[PDB]
Every structure is written in structure tokens, then in C-alpha cells.
């Protein structure tokens, strides 16, 4: 269903054109009504990240070759292997007890070096998000009842795009993005076929070998490679067991991303408000008023955590009217003095028996989610935790 704009949402000038100022959320439509002309629908289709740069790989399962060992007797110098200079080898130097029993003339410590080639069987990719290339697509079709669909393609840097509509004429949309998470503090972690949004610092502090997105050598191999004590001519090297399970566990408290089925590198987001100023030539537009809902509502989906500190609920308005759903978040049931923040812009049930999504930002700690007003109001208690960076 589509929601009509109010009078204050647009402004018609004596000379020039009429500007519409709408805040667009995902999967919520907003319609523009003009007398003797079809209503114009405007909806945010998607917010996506296209081709993020891989900034780091994290190994969680390694494979070694056999152990190459050069060893020298006492008073014969240092034992060197030419593999010590290859960066993809796991090398270690030490001294082993030598003597007559193992082919050395005099007793004492003999130099010894062991190297084993390090390959990464399975790695986790960490992607960098360029916020100047966050895409957002806006659709605009004339109401059906030349009703073709106009799809405009945006990206943070290019925020001004043009279009034309029947009757309304040429249009200019000047839009902005506000992401739901800070991609300056976050990576896109891609382990198997799955993917997540993880914090940057949580990812650098992992005790696993890592490799730059630019390439190079696998650094800090010692998290998966272990060198046993020597026995006079030999050193055992062990690749520590696969660590996918330990990594998949630490990603439990991390929100997920979904690749597009076709593009397969489009990481399309869900949260995010697109603030557009629609610019049109001069024409009178139709407004719409909304009374506040005054009848009993019900939680279709009880308030749930979204992954980025906000709570989503889905209430049903079966009776009242095309109406605005009053939502506040308070410390106590007494004052009804709001302490939270209403993320959702204009929670409006267009028709009766409709189900409306509502996003809210409770204060940290205990609070009460209040939907409605008076005595036929929904009261849901909430708890909010300290928002660690991981684990």
C-alpha cells in the first residue's frame, strides 16, 4: 500500500516549480496526489554495495608440506635453508644436542633450521566499503486504475538524477543516503557461501594468520603452525586443526548481509533512510491529513532485535481509520515521557486490517515500548545491552 503526502510535505511557488520533501524507507511506498492527474508513487527499491574492495584474508585452515631440515654439527657454523627467504614458508631456527651418536665429532649445541611450506586451504575475506559508492535505486510509477515504471539509479557521489513523468513533466530528484551501520567501523566478512557485517577491530584482533588484499605473504602463521622440540636431527611441524567452528561461533552475535542472486557481488542492505527533495515544475498537488489511531491494535510481530541496536515491531490496525500509529518509549508506565527515538518516519496504516512495520531505538537498559494511547495501548518491556564490538 502507498501513503499519501501531507500539505507541509510539498510547497508550490508563485513562480518556478513545486518541491516535494519526502523521507524514503525500504519497502515503504509514498504517493504524490495531483488533482485531475494520476497519483505518482515513489518507493525506495534497494540500497546496495557493489564490488567492495577485499582488504584482508584470514586463514582458518592451513596445509603444510613435509619438513625440510638443514642441520650442522658444533663448530661448523649456522645451518641455513634457501627456503628461509621465501615468505610462504614456515621456518624456525633453534639448536639441537649433537655428539658422537648422531655424526658429530665433538659434543654441544648444533645449529638447526626447519621450514615447511604454508598454504591456506580455507580463508575468510574482509571487504572495505566505499561510502562514496553506496548505491540506492528509486522507483516511480504512475498509479494504475502511460503508467510505465521509471527506475532511477543513484550512488552517494551522484545524488542528483533526472526523470520525466506523464502530466507532471520533467523531474529532478536530489537524494541522500543514511546507512543504518557505520561502514567506516565495519567490514563485510565473507566466510563460506555465507556473509556478515563485522566490526573492523574485532577482525584485526583475531588470532589467525592474515593476508593483505594487496597480496603478499601470509603473516603470523604461528597461530596455525607449531614447531616441536628438536631431537638431535629432526623437528616436527604440526598444522593446528581447522578453526572454522571457533570462527563461526564468534560470528553468532553479528548481523548478516545477503548477496543478490544474480549480481552475486551486490551486498544489498535493508536499513537506511533516503532523504529526497523531488523538484517539479509548477502544479497544484493534493494533500492528505491523518488522524491519530484511537482503537485497539495488536502486535503481529513482537518487538525484535534487528542487529544494529534498533527494534522492529509489526502492529495491526484492524478498526480505526487511515491513521498514524502513536509510538513512544518510556522509562516507566506512569509519565509516558518519551526517552527513546522513533526511527520509522510516519507510521501510517493506510487501510484497516493493515500491518505496519515500526522501528524504534530504546534507551540503554530497561524501558517500556508503548504503542497507542490511553488504556487500549500495547505495552512491551525491553532490555538493551552494552553493545560490544564482537563475540
Amino acid at each position, epitope marked *: 500500500h502507498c501513503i499519501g503526502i501531507t500539505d507541509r510535505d510539498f510547497i508550490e511557488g508563485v513562480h518556478g516549480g513545486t518541491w516535494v520533501s519526502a523521507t524514503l524507507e525500504q519497502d515503504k511506498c509514498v504517493t504524490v496526489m495531483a488533482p485531475d492527474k494520476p497519483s505518482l508513487d515513489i518507493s525506495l527499491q534497494t540500497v546496495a554495495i557493489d564490488g567492495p574492495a577485499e582488504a584482508r584474508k584470514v586463514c582458518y585452515s592451513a*596445509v*603444510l*608440506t*613435509h619438513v*625440510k*631440515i*638443514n*642441520d*650442522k654439527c658444533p663448530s661448523t657454523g649456522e*645451518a*641455513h*635453508l*634457501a*627456503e628461509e627467504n*621465501d615468505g610462504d614458508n614456515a621456518c624456525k631456527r633453534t639448536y639441537s644436542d649433537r655428539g658422537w651418536g*648422531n*655424526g658429530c665429532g665433538l659434543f654441544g649445541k648444533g645449529s638447526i633450521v626447519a621450514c615447511a*611450506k604454508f*598454504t591456506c*586451504a580455507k580463508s575468510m575475506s574482509l571487504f572495505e566499503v566505499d561510502q562514496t559508492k553506496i548505491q540506492y535505486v528509486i522507483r516511480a510509477q504512475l498509479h494504475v486504475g502511460n503508467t510505465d515504471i521509471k527506475t532511477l539509479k543513484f550512488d552517494a557521489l551522484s545524488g542528483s538524477q533526472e526523470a520525466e513523468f506523464t502530466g507532471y513533466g520533467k523531474a529532478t530528484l536530489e537524494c541522500q543516503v543514511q546507512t543504518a551501520v557505520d561502514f567506516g567501523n565495519s567490514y563485510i566478512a565473507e566466510m563460506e557461501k555465507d556473509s556478515w557485517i563485522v566490526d573492523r577491530q574485532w577482525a584485526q584482533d583475531l588470532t589467525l594468520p592474515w593476508q593483505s588484499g594487496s597480496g603478499g605473504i601470509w603473516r603470523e602463521m604461528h597461530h596455525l603452525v607449531e614447531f616441536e622440540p628438536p631431537h638431535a*636431527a*629432526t623437528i616436527r611441524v604440526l598444522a593446528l586443526g581447522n578453526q572454522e567452528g571457533s570462527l563461526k561461533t564468534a560470528l553468532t552475535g553479528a548481523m548478516r548481509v545477503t548477496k543478490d542472486e544474480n549480481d552475486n557481488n551486490l551486498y544489498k542492505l535493508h536499513g537506511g533512510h533516503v532523504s529526497c527533495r523531488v523538484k517539479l515544475s509548477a502544479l497544484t498537488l493534493k494533500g492528505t491529513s491523518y488522524k491519530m489511531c484511537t482503537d485497539k491494535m495488536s502486535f503481529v510481530k513482537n518487538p525484535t532485535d534487528t542487529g544494529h541496536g534498533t527494534v522492529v515491531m509489526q502492529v495491526k490496525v484492524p478498526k480505526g481509520a487511515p491513521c498514524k500509529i502513536p509510538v513512544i518509549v518510556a522509562d516507566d508506565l506512569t509519565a509516558a515521557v518519551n526517552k527513546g527515538i522513533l526511527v520509522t518516519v510516519n507510521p501510517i496504516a493506510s487501510t484497516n486490517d493493515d500491518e505496519v512495520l515500526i522501528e524504534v531505538n530504546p534507551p540503554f537498559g530497561d524501558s517500556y515500548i508503548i504503542v497507542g494511547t490511553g488504556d487500549s495501548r500495547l505495552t512491551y518491556q525491553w532490555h538493551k545491552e552494552g553493545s560490544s564490538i564482537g563475540k
Partner: antibody, heavy 117, light 112 residues
Framework: EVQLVESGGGLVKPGGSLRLSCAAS????????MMWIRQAPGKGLEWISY????????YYTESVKGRFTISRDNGKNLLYLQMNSLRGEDTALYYC??????????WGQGTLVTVSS | QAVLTQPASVSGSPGQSITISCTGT?????????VSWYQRHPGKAPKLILY???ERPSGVSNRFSGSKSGNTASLTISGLQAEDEADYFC???????????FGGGTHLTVLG
């Protein structure tokens, strides 16, 4: 530059003994692993003996584990292969090669070992 | 005959681009990604022309290229010269027990 030279191949009867020698130059012999490789008639190449830089680690294939014995003289830049209990299956072109980086690097011209009863 | 499989005979005219394949099995080439290619003129020593799939030692011409997809490692020679006529071999570090397995060899012919 780097060179390996095989010698000691020839003709011998089954059950007999033969010793292969491989002289190296152009690199530090005591720093690199060396190995013996043979190419049997109608078969692919096959490493049969593998020795470490100091001679402390020895590896053999099952076909030769009891019969062949590989050694090296890092003072004389010589790699040896003592072949005992020679059979018909052991007739092949025999190579000595260096192994650095988990790949066989430099080879020798090879010496021919024929066994006919 | 062998464990790695390469065609017995391949031939090409001078200037042509010729590709020699080396088909391995699973747990023969897919794990370590270190595959070597050798060239042997008759009576001479085999010369390493490719190692680590795509890497080329010093002095090996840019005509020789290396690639791999799944089981099949491939050697490709472009600008085929007369000198390239030799036997080409294929080595792969299979596992920690057998270490290296070789290809049967491939006779390359330059039609003059």
C-alpha cells in the same frame, strides 16, 4: 653455471650390484636436498631416493627400500646411489637432481642402466 | 604407465600457439598448487621452465605460459620456434607421503 654430472651407469646382470655417482658444481652442495629419479621403459618419471642437505633425512620408494642406498659427500660435492639386487624393473635412465622450494630444480644429463639376464 | 596424464604427441607449425595438458586427479594437484614443467632435449638435462603453476625461472622465454583449472595443469607455447622441439614433463607435489608424481611425457614436434 650450476651443473650435475651422472656417471657409473652401464650394463649388468640381475642380482648384481651397481653404484651411481653425481658430481655437483656451481652451488653450495651442503645446503640443498638432492634426489635420484629414473625413467623406466614405457613408464613415467619416478623419484626413488631423496636425501637431505646434511644426509640426516632419507626417503625411499617401496620398490627400492631394501635394495638401494643413497648417500652424499658434502665435502667432495658427490651424491651417491648404491644399487644392489638389481632386477629387470630397475632398467631405466637415472637422473640426479636438486630439490629446492618443494620442486625438482636442476637435473643432470642422466646415465643409462640396463639389466639383461 | 603414469599417475599424471599428458598427451603422448603434440605437434605444431612455427609461429603457432600450442598447448600441452597435464591432467591429474583429486588430492594430486588441487591441494598444494605447486606444479612444475620441465623441458628435455634428447641427451641433455631436463630444464625447469615453469614452477608454482604460472611462475617462470630466469631465462625462460615469455612464450612459455602456465595455468591450471581443477585437475588439468596446462603448458602453453606461443610463437613456436624450432628449438622448442623436446619432451615436456609434469610434476606435482601430491601429498606428504608420496611427495612428487610425474607425467608420462609429451613429444613436441615443430614441423619444418
Amino acid at each position: 653455471e650450476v651443473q650435475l654430472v651422472e656417471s657409473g651407469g652401464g650394463l649388468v646382470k640381475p642380482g648384481g650390484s651397481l653404484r651411481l655417482s653425481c658430481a655437483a658444481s656451481g652451488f653450495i652442495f651442503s645446503d640443498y636436498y638432492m634426489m635420484w629419479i629414473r625413467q623406466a621403459p614405457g613408464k613415467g618419471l619416478e623419484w626413488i631416493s631423496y636425501i637431505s642437505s646434511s644426509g640426516s633425512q632419507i626417503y625411499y620408494t617401496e620398490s627400492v627400500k631394501g635394495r638401494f642406498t643413497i648417500s652424499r659427500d658434502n665435502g667432495k660435492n658427490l651424491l651417491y646411489l648404491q644399487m644392489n639386487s638389481l632386477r629387470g624393473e630397475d632398467t631405466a635412465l637415472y637422473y640426479c637432481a636438486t630439490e629446492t622450494g618443494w620442486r625438482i630444480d636442476t637435473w643432470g644429463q642422466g646415465t643409462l642402466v640396463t639389466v639383461s639376464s | 604407465q603414469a599417475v599424471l596424464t599428458q598427451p603422448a604427441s603434440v605437434s605444431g607449425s612455427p609461429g603457432q600457439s600450442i598447448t600441452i595438458s597435464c591432467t591429474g586427479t583429486g588430492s594430486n594437484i588441487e591441494t598444494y598448487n605447486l606444479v612444475s614443467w620441465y623441458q628435455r632435449h634428447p641427451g641433455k638435462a631436463p630444464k625447469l621452465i615453469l614452477y608454482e603453476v604460472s611462475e617462470r625461472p630466469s631465462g625462460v622465454s615469455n612464450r612459455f605460459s602456465g595455468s591450471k583449472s581443477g585437475n588439468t595443469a596446462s603448458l602453453t607455447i606461443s610463437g613456436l620456434q624450432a628449438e622448442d622441439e623436446a619432451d615436456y614433463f609434469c610434476c606435482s607435489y601430491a601429498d606428504t607421503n608420496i611427495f612428487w608424481v610425474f607425467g608420462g611425457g609429451t613429444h613436441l614436434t615443430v614441423l619444418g
